[PDB]
Scaffold this active site. Structure first.
Site, short mmCIF file in Angstrom:
data_model
loop_
_atom_site.label_atom_id
_atom_site.label_comp_id
_atom_site.label_asym_id
_atom_site.label_seq_id
_atom_site.Cartn_x
_atom_site.Cartn_y
_atom_site.Cartn_z
N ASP A 69 42.96 49.67 18.24
CA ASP A 69 44.02 50.28 17.50
C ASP A 69 44.46 51.44 17.53
O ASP A 69 44.95 51.96 16.90
CB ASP A 69 44.73 50.07 16.11
CG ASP A 69 45.97 49.71 16.00
OD1 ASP A 69 46.14 49.98 16.10
OD2 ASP A 69 46.37 49.24 14.72
N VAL A 77 48.80 51.62 1.15
CA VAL A 77 47.75 52.97 0.02
C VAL A 77 48.10 54.01 -0.97
O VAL A 77 49.15 53.93 -0.63
CB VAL A 77 47.86 53.39 1.64
CG1 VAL A 77 46.37 54.59 1.47
CG2 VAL A 77 47.31 53.15 3.27
N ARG A 112 49.22 57.43 15.19
CA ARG A 112 49.95 57.10 13.94
C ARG A 112 48.07 56.49 12.98
O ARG A 112 47.99 56.87 12.47
CB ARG A 112 50.42 55.90 13.71
CG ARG A 112 49.89 54.45 14.44
CD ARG A 112 50.43 53.57 14.23
NE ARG A 112 50.19 51.69 15.29
CZ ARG A 112 50.02 52.27 16.54
NH1 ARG A 112 51.27 52.79 17.42
NH2 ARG A 112 50.10 51.44 16.94
N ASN A 113 47.04 56.17 13.85
CA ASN A 113 45.72 55.92 13.66
C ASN A 113 44.46 57.55 13.64
O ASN A 113 43.66 57.01 13.46
CB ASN A 113 45.44 54.69 13.89
CG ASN A 113 46.21 53.88 13.49
OD1 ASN A 113 47.16 53.08 12.13
ND2 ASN A 113 46.32 52.50 14.72
N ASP A 143 40.68 53.71 10.61
CA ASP A 143 41.45 53.15 10.54
C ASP A 143 41.23 51.78 12.11
O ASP A 143 41.66 51.64 12.94
CB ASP A 143 43.19 52.74 10.83
CG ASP A 143 44.32 53.80 9.60
OD1 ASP A 143 44.19 53.34 9.09
OD2 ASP A 143 44.70 54.82 10.32
O1 LIG Z 1 44.10 60.29 3.55
C1 LIG Z 1 44.94 59.24 4.29
C2 LIG Z 1 46.19 60.17 3.86
C3 LIG Z 1 47.23 59.35 3.70
C4 LIG Z 1 48.38 59.48 3.54
C5 LIG Z 1 50.76 59.52 2.91
C6 LIG Z 1 50.80 61.00 2.07
F1 LIG Z 1 52.07 60.82 2.26
C7 LIG Z 1 50.21 62.23 2.55
C8 LIG Z 1 48.79 62.12 3.37
C9 LIG Z 1 47.89 61.23 3.14
N1 LIG Z 1 47.06 61.35 3.85
N2 LIG Z 1 44.32 58.19 4.45
C10 LIG Z 1 45.95 56.79 5.07
C11 LIG Z 1 44.76 56.46 6.32
C12 LIG Z 1 45.10 55.45 5.31
C13 LIG Z 1 45.58 53.97 6.29
N3 LIG Z 1 46.45 55.16 7.43
C14 LIG Z 1 47.52 54.85 8.09
C15 LIG Z 1 47.85 53.69 8.15
C16 LIG Z 1 49.62 53.24 8.88
C17 LIG Z 1 49.44 54.12 10.21
N4 LIG Z 1 49.02 55.93 10.07
C18 LIG Z 1 48.22 55.56 9.25
C19 LIG Z 1 45.74 56.27 7.07
C20 LIG Z 1 43.79 57.40 6.21
C21 LIG Z 1 42.02 57.07 7.24
C22 LIG Z 1 41.53 57.40 6.83
C23 LIG Z 1 41.25 58.69 6.23
C24 LIG Z 1 42.01 58.84 5.32
C25 LIG Z 1 43.36 58.55 4.84
#
Ligand SMILES: O=C(c1cc2cc(F)ccc2[nH]1)N1C[C@]2(CCN([C@@H]3CCCNC3)C2)c2ccccc21
Length: 241
Positions: free
Chosen positions: A121, A21, A125-126, A139
């Protein structure tokens, strides 16, 4: 369909098995990096775009690079698992806040199941933390053995009832502040552990009524597990008390 998007890629935000990402400027967003496979990605992308609920992460859109890409709103507070961990290793959150996270997730999952959508899932974490610290299910899936119901592990069956089992595991993660479920038990032995009649243990400080609810989510009989509507009602009542 007004779902596909012709933005420029920026800093790396994170990576894993699912891919990586990075942030991008469209507005700041998060961009998820991932013939037939690229086909149905787009198909299901179109159905996810119409999710509209305060406790489900919005889909901004999808795009194609030369790898399929998912374009998401940037949520600076990150995911719930990392937050629970950051409390332990150190902020402190009342029981009220932990139960409220469960209510939030139950609302978003209630919404998804109302649309006939099976997450597959669900895990801390999600779940993402929004600006107002509300939790949003994310996710959706454009192996996680420790969150999988008996019938998912044995028969590859994914339903609302297996989503509910993973919700129960998620409640346990919330109550343990991000501890790995079944710590010191390997993935390859999880099934054997479960058909044994063994479950995740009541965390030391955990309110009995909260443990009773998550325990219900892990019934061997999928029809015996509560619905997300019933979870939300019971969690809201607890929160009101
Ligand atoms: O906005 C962010 C974000 C990333 C991120 C990273 C950072 F370091 C700080 C703020 C952040 N914000 N993201 C990250 C994810 C995409 C992948 N996902 C991970 C996959 C692996 C398992 N955990 C979930 C969560 C997401 C889904 C919906 C809306 C937003 C976001």
């Amino acid at each position: 369909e007004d779902v596909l998007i012709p933005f420029t890629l920026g800093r790396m935000l994170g990576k894993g098995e699912f891919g990586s990402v990075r942030e991008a400027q469209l507005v700041k967003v998060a961009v998820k990096m991932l013939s037939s496979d690229i086909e149905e990605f787009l198909r299901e992308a179109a159905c996810m775009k119409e999710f509209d609920h305060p406790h489900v992460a919005k889909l901004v859109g999808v795009s194609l690079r030369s790898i399929p890409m998912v374009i998401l709103p940037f949520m600076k507070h990150g995911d719930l698992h990392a937050f629970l961990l950051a409390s332990r290793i150190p902020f402190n959150l009342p029981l009220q806040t932990l139960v409220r996270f469960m209510v939030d997730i139950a609302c978003g999952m209630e919404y998804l199941s109302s649309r006939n959508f099976i997450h597959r899932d669900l895990a801390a974490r999600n779940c993402m933390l929004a600006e107002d610290m509300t939790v949003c299910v994310a996710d959706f899936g454009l192996l996680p053995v420790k969150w999988l119901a008996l019938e998912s592990l044995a028969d590859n069956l994914y339903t609302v009832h297996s989503d509910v089992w993973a919700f129960g595991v998620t409640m346990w993660e919330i109550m343990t502040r991000g501890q790995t479920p079944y710590a010191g038990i390997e993935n390859a032995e999880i099934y054997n552990y479960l058909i044994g009649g063994n479950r995740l243990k009541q965390p030391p400080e955990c309110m009995e009524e909260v443990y009773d609810l998550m325990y219900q989510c892990w019934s061997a009989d999928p029809k015996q597990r509560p619905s997300f509507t019933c979870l939300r009602m019971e969690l809201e009542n607890i929160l009101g008390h």
